[PDB]
Design a protein around this motif. Structure first.
Motif, PDB file in Angstrom:
ATOM      1  N   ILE A 193       0.840  -1.192   0.000  1.00 44.42           N
ATOM      2  CA  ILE A 193       0.000   0.000   0.000  1.00 44.42           C
ATOM      3  C   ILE A 193       0.878   1.245   0.000  1.00 44.42           C
ATOM      4  O   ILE A 193       1.939   1.272   0.632  1.00 44.42           O
ATOM      5  CB  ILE A 193      -0.959   0.011   1.213  1.00 44.42           C
ATOM      6  N   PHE A 194       0.438   2.269  -0.729  1.00 46.02           N
ATOM      7  CA  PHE A 194       1.042   3.592  -0.681  1.00 46.02           C
ATOM      8  C   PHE A 194       0.222   4.481   0.242  1.00 46.02           C
ATOM      9  O   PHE A 194      -1.003   4.560   0.106  1.00 46.02           O
ATOM     10  CB  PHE A 194       1.114   4.228  -2.071  1.00 46.02           C
ATOM     11  N   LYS A 195       0.895   5.141   1.182  1.00 50.40           N
ATOM     12  CA  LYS A 195       0.236   6.146   2.010  1.00 50.40           C
ATOM     13  C   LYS A 195       0.373   7.533   1.390  1.00 50.40           C
ATOM     14  O   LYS A 195      -0.628   8.189   1.083  1.00 50.40           O
ATOM     15  CB  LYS A 195       0.810   6.117   3.430  1.00 50.40           C
ATOM     16  N   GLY A 196       1.607   7.993   1.221  1.00 46.02           N
ATOM     17  CA  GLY A 196       1.899   9.114   0.356  1.00 46.02           C
ATOM     18  C   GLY A 196       3.385   9.271   0.134  1.00 46.02           C
ATOM     19  O   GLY A 196       4.167   9.346   1.088  1.00 46.02           O
ATOM     20  N   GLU A 197       3.772   9.362  -1.136  1.00 43.85           N
ATOM     21  CA  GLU A 197       5.170   9.445  -1.553  1.00 43.85           C
ATOM     22  C   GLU A 197       6.044   8.361  -0.912  1.00 43.85           C
ATOM     23  O   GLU A 197       7.260   8.530  -0.799  1.00 43.85           O
ATOM     24  CB  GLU A 197       5.747  10.834  -1.265  1.00 43.85           C
ATOM     25  N   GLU A 198       5.456   7.242  -0.488  1.00 53.17           N
ATOM     26  CA  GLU A 198       6.214   6.158   0.126  1.00 53.17           C
ATOM     27  C   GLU A 198       5.385   4.884   0.047  1.00 53.17           C
ATOM     28  O   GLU A 198       4.198   4.911  -0.287  1.00 53.17           O
ATOM     29  CB  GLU A 198       6.603   6.487   1.574  1.00 53.17           C
ATOM     30  N   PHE A 199       6.029   3.763   0.363  1.00 53.42           N
ATOM     31  CA  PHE A 199       5.450   2.439   0.187  1.00 53.42           C
ATOM     32  C   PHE A 199       5.459   1.663   1.497  1.00 53.42           C
ATOM     33  O   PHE A 199       6.460   1.655   2.220  1.00 53.42           O
ATOM     34  CB  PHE A 199       6.211   1.654  -0.884  1.00 53.42           C
ATOM     35  N   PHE A 200       4.337   1.009   1.787  1.00 53.35           N
ATOM     36  CA  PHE A 200       4.195   0.106   2.921  1.00 53.35           C
ATOM     37  C   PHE A 200       3.863  -1.290   2.411  1.00 53.35           C
ATOM     38  O   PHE A 200       3.020  -1.452   1.523  1.00 53.35           O
ATOM     39  CB  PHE A 200       3.096   0.580   3.882  1.00 53.35           C
ATOM     40  N   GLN A 201       4.526  -2.297   2.975  1.00 55.17           N
ATOM     41  CA  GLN A 201       4.333  -3.683   2.573  1.00 55.17           C
ATOM     42  C   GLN A 201       3.384  -4.370   3.543  1.00 55.17           C
ATOM     43  O   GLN A 201       3.569  -4.293   4.763  1.00 55.17           O
ATOM     44  CB  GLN A 201       5.670  -4.426   2.522  1.00 55.17           C
ATOM     45  N   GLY A 202       2.372  -5.040   3.003  1.00 56.08           N
ATOM     46  CA  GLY A 202       1.399  -5.714   3.836  1.00 56.08           C
ATOM     47  C   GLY A 202       0.266  -6.276   2.999  1.00 56.08           C
ATOM     48  O   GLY A 202       0.319  -6.281   1.767  1.00 56.08           O
ATOM     49  N   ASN A 203      -0.757  -6.748   3.700  1.00 60.02           N
ATOM     50  CA  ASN A 203      -1.927  -7.363   3.080  1.00 60.02           C
ATOM     51  C   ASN A 203      -3.134  -7.078   3.970  1.00 60.02           C
ATOM     52  O   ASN A 203      -3.097  -6.173   4.810  1.00 60.02           O
ATOM     53  CB  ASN A 203      -1.688  -8.866   2.850  1.00 60.02           C
ATOM     54  N   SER A 204      -4.210  -7.845   3.778  1.00 57.61           N
ATOM     55  CA  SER A 204      -5.447  -7.695   4.554  1.00 57.61           C
ATOM     56  C   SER A 204      -6.016  -6.285   4.416  1.00 57.61           C
ATOM     57  O   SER A 204      -6.457  -5.670   5.389  1.00 57.61           O
ATOM     58  CB  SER A 204      -5.229  -8.055   6.025  1.00 57.61           C
ATOM     59  N   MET A 205      -6.005  -5.779   3.189  1.00 58.04           N
ATOM     60  CA  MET A 205      -6.426  -4.423   2.865  1.00 58.04           C
ATOM     61  C   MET A 205      -7.326  -4.465   1.638  1.00 58.04           C
ATOM     62  O   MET A 205      -6.964  -5.048   0.612  1.00 58.04           O
ATOM     63  CB  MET A 205      -5.190  -3.537   2.671  1.00 58.04           C
ATOM     64  N   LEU A 206      -8.508  -3.873   1.759  1.00 61.16           N
ATOM     65  CA  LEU A 206      -9.588  -4.103   0.800  1.00 61.16           C
ATOM     66  C   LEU A 206     -10.059  -2.804   0.167  1.00 61.16           C
ATOM     67  O   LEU A 206     -10.663  -1.964   0.860  1.00 61.16           O
ATOM     68  CB  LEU A 206     -10.757  -4.802   1.491  1.00 61.16           C
ATOM     69  N   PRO A 207      -9.817  -2.588  -1.123  1.00 67.61           N
ATOM     70  CA  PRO A 207     -10.435  -1.444  -1.799  1.00 67.61           C
ATOM     71  C   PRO A 207     -11.917  -1.689  -2.029  1.00 67.61           C
ATOM     72  O   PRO A 207     -12.330  -2.774  -2.446  1.00 67.61           O
ATOM     73  CB  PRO A 207      -9.663  -1.359  -3.119  1.00 67.61           C
ATOM     74  N   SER A 208     -12.721  -0.667  -1.747  1.00 65.55           N
ATOM     75  CA  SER A 208     -14.155  -0.779  -1.943  1.00 65.55           C
ATOM     76  C   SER A 208     -14.470  -0.938  -3.429  1.00 65.55           C
ATOM     77  O   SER A 208     -13.719  -0.461  -4.282  1.00 65.55           O
ATOM     78  CB  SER A 208     -14.868   0.450  -1.385  1.00 65.55           C
ATOM     79  N   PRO A 209     -15.564  -1.617  -3.766  1.00 66.34           N
ATOM     80  CA  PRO A 209     -15.887  -1.828  -5.180  1.00 66.34           C
ATOM     81  C   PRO A 209     -16.148  -0.511  -5.894  1.00 66.34           C
ATOM     82  O   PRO A 209     -16.512   0.490  -5.275  1.00 66.34           O
ATOM     83  CB  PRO A 209     -17.145  -2.698  -5.133  1.00 66.34           C
ATOM     84  N   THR A 210     -15.928  -0.523  -7.211  1.00 69.33           N
ATOM     85  CA  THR A 210     -16.077   0.580  -8.167  1.00 69.33           C
ATOM     86  C   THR A 210     -14.857   1.508  -8.094  1.00 69.33           C
ATOM     87  O   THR A 210     -14.750   2.443  -8.899  1.00 69.33           O
ATOM     88  CB  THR A 210     -17.392   1.362  -7.958  1.00 69.33           C
ATOM     89  N   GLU A 211     -13.905   1.251  -7.200  1.00 68.10           N
ATOM     90  CA  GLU A 211     -12.713   2.085  -7.130  1.00 68.10           C
ATOM     91  C   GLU A 211     -11.918   1.984  -8.431  1.00 68.10           C
ATOM     92  O   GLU A 211     -11.811   0.899  -9.013  1.00 68.10           O
ATOM     93  CB  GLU A 211     -11.829   1.679  -5.951  1.00 68.10           C
ATOM     94  N   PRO A 212     -11.358   3.089  -8.915  1.00 67.86           N
ATOM     95  CA  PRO A 212     -10.607   3.051 -10.175  1.00 67.86           C
ATOM     96  C   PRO A 212      -9.338   2.221 -10.065  1.00 67.86           C
ATOM     97  O   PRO A 212      -8.763   2.051  -8.986  1.00 67.86           O
ATOM     98  CB  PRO A 212     -10.276   4.527 -10.437  1.00 67.86           C
TER      99      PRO A 212
END
Lengths: 59, 58
Positions: free
Chosen positions: B15-34
């Motif tokens: 996942i990107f928070k801002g201008e940086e990268f975090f490594q992980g899982n168990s993270m769900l984008p809501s449907p219809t997200e681009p």
């Protein structure tokens, strides 16, 4: 007699089964070797098998 | 047959928070997200460490 074990290892598939099977509690951090995860799953108590699937994901 | 459906099976890795990268899982984008394509600068910011320990393997 006043002695117990708190075994620590990276490769449970390599530590002899005669001792790991005697561990009553477990402290499980992230595991990424499938051969080790399968062993730790089979050795765990039955109630924790469902919740044990987090090991590859824990960070 | 009435319409063309294009479906991709895709796995989360970080996942990107801002201008940086975090490594992980168990993270769900809501449907219809681009969904976008990754730019090359965003890719090369990852896979790159501090200059004291960089090994250009190719």
């Amino acid at each position: 007699y006043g002695l117990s074990l708190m075994v620590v290892s990276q490769r449970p598939s390599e530590v002899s089964d005669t001792i790991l099977s005697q561990c009553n509690n477990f402290i499980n951090l992230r595991l990424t070797n499938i051969n080790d995860q399968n062993y730790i799953k089979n050795l765990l108590p039955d109630n924790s098998r469902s919740i044990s699937e987090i090991l590859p994901t824990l960070g | 047959k009435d319409e063309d459906i294009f479906i991709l099976t895709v796995q989360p890795v970080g996942i990107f928070k801002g201008e940086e990268f975090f490594q992980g899982n168990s993270m769900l984008p809501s449907p219809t997200e681009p969904v976008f394509l990754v730019e090359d600068d965003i890719l090369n910011k990852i896979f790159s460490n501090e200059k004291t320990k960089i090994f250009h393997l190719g």
